């Protein structure tokens, strides 16, 4: 079946934790991809590009393919996985595993007057990887995802429907742009807003109380 090897992987297997927000709440480290695909059973993966990389050797170039995979359900969770393998099919599968392992929550907000469900981002957010930084600006209804197709797909896989995007650097370096967007998309929960100035109490962690579900 699965037979997880981790306390957190055991807890999700045992069913004592049912939300990925509870994993995100206590910043738990996740090391198995099987716990992502059970706690988020609606993740859709995609491939933004496949490119070969070559290491020059004494006799010829060793060609390996770098697969970029973006994983996410269409509401609030998104992941990004890069893996270079000797075969494209092997790289896709492993890059899926890394993409699910790296899934993060998304903070969707409103452009104004909190009328319906969150359609946009709560704040302006920026992330940088290499020379690339991606700026994400909240947009009103109907604006859509104003972004390049590669950034756009990851962003619609996150659950946002109205956004503005602004970039600089080598946007043609695809892996950097997606990682820069991933950081900006991830930094949406790092930003502290007045409605998040609330009380401390921080209840017990799932791993401490449910430690009865250890390897024994």
């Amino acid at each position: 079946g699965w037979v997880p090897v981790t306390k957190l992987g055991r807890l999700v297997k045992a069913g004592k934790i049912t939300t990925i927000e509870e994993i995100f709440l206590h910043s738990l480290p996740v090391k198995e991809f099987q716990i992502i695909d059970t706690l988020l059973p609606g993740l859709q993966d995609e491939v933004m590009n496949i490119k070969p990389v070559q290491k020059q050797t004494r006799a010829g170039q060793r060609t390996r393919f770098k697969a970029v995979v973006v994983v996410g359900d269409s509401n609030g969770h998104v992941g990004l996985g890069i893996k270079t393998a000797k075969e494209v099919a092997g790289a896709i599968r492993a890059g899926i595993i890394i993409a699910k392992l790296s899934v993060i929550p998304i903070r969707r907000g409103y452009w104004g007057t909190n009328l319906g469900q969150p359609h946009s981002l709560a704040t302006k957010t920026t992330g940088k990887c290499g020379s690339v930084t991606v700026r994400l600006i909240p947009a009103p209804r109907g604006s859509g995802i104003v972004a390049s197709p590669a950034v756009k797909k990851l962003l619609q896989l996150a659950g946002v429907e109205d956004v503005y995007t602004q970039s600089n650097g080598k946007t043609r370096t695809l892996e950097n742009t997606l990682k820069a967007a991933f950081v900006a998309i991830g930094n949406t929960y790092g930003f502290l807003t007045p409605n998040l100035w609330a009380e401390q109490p921080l209840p017990v962690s799932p791993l401490d109380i449910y430690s009865d579900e250890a390897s024994a």
């Binding site: 709440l25 910043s27 929550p105 929960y189 409605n195």
Partner: protein, 87 residues
């Protein structure tokens, strides 16, 4: 955020570091949750009773984590003459 028409939203209201009150990120794996047990008039740790402190990975990497805990728990009264405000 949460509007009036129900609409259960703002998933995962995150924790905040006790020392600095900054948001603990979902993958900030340098942050810790300190559990300091309580004792009831006999020097025996009563189960399930402890004061909890969230400690951001930022202060942990800065070496201020030890100083922060001495100040926080002294303010809570479980250390007496360790931390000085006037340093």
């Amino acid at each position: 955020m949460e509007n009036d028409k129900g609409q259960l939203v703002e998933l995962y209201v995150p924790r905040k570091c006790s020392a600095t009150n900054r948001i603990i990120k979902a993958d900030d794996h340098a942050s810790v949750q300190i559990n300091v047990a309580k004792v009831d008039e006999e020097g025996r740790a009563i189960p399930g009773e402890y004061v909890t402190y969230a400690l951001s990975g930022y202060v942990r990497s800065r070496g201020e984590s030890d100083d922060s805990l001495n100040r926080l728990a002294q303010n809570d009264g479980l250390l007496k003459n360790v931390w000085s405000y006037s340093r």
